[PDB]
Amino acid sequence: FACKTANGTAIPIGGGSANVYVNLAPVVNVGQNLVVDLSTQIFCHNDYPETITDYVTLQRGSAYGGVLSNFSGTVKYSGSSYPFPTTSETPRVVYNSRTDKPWPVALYLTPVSSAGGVAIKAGSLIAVLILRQTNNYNSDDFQFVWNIYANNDVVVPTGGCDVSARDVTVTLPDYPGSVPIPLTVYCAKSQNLGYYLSGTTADAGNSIFTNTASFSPAQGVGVQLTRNGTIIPANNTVSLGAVGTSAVSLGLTANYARTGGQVTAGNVQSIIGVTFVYQ
Amino acid sequence: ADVTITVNGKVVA
């Protein structure tokens, strides 16, 4: 039993714990969300298949780590699903050739939000997996640890639904023009969704986000969002109806709006949060 | 929040 990652990097085997860097592509699925498909990221083989057969199981106590430590879910191991953190030893995977074959493991998370996410930066710990290796000819029976680290920055969805982008940037035409905001949401199964806006406002109507531009800020103006011509105040939930597997636009447009006194020349910037809720 | 929107603009002189 000897393994390497997708880019060909050897995983030092047995003995001390190994730190294994993998690419992940987390997505919502029905009832659980994929965190990482390891089967495209870790490949193993047997250097003596004519005379030795290798067996590997995933041991009890394998679990998420780092920012995912408090989540539970499931592990798909060799085509079958088990609770994760693991509560029993899995069946074995057999390595019976010199040709590399996947380590057939995928990690899933049980949703706890509507459309939330947890950022995982490259270099961060994802999971701690405990493996047990045996064979078909002697008593060798050794257990060792693979610490699975992100090779790439991702946002792991924690809900039933996911968004087109977690960080959206738009630029208004020069005052007084407006700009549509490209932002959509979809769900793994049909869900009834709403959303609300968060941020600092300047006006009696709690609907004009303050201008926080750092350099040469314009005075007397902020940013106001509308959907189909209707102003959306902060902290007032907008309904999206039922969102299915195809993306639904939030329907948002950004506008300038006056906050009082003279409008003066300069830069404008506002940072506005969007939070989804089930309805 | 689940998404952050940054809106930039300008009032020209």
Author numbering:
A (entry chain A): 1 to 279
B (entry chain B): 1 to 13
Paper's wording?
FimH is a two-domain protein, composed of an N-terminal, mannoside-binding lectin domain (FimHL) and a C-terminal pilin domain (FimHP). FimHP possesses an incomplete immunoglobulin-like fold that is completed by insertion of an N-terminal donor strand of FimG, the subsequent subunit in pilus assembly.
The experiments described in the following were performed with FimH from the faecal E. coli strain F18 (FimHF18), which is structurally identical to the most prevalent variants in uropathogenic infection, and FimH from the wild-type E. coli strain K12 (FimHK12), which differ in three amino acids in FimHL (K12→F18: Val27Ala, Asn70Ser, Ser78Asn). In the absence of ligands, FimH adopts the Afree state with associated FimHL and FimHP and an open conformation of the ligand-binding site, which is responsible for the 30-fold faster ligand-binding of full-length FimH as compared with the isolated FimHL domain. Our biophysical data demonstrate that this mechanism is conserved between the K12 and the F18 E. coli strains.
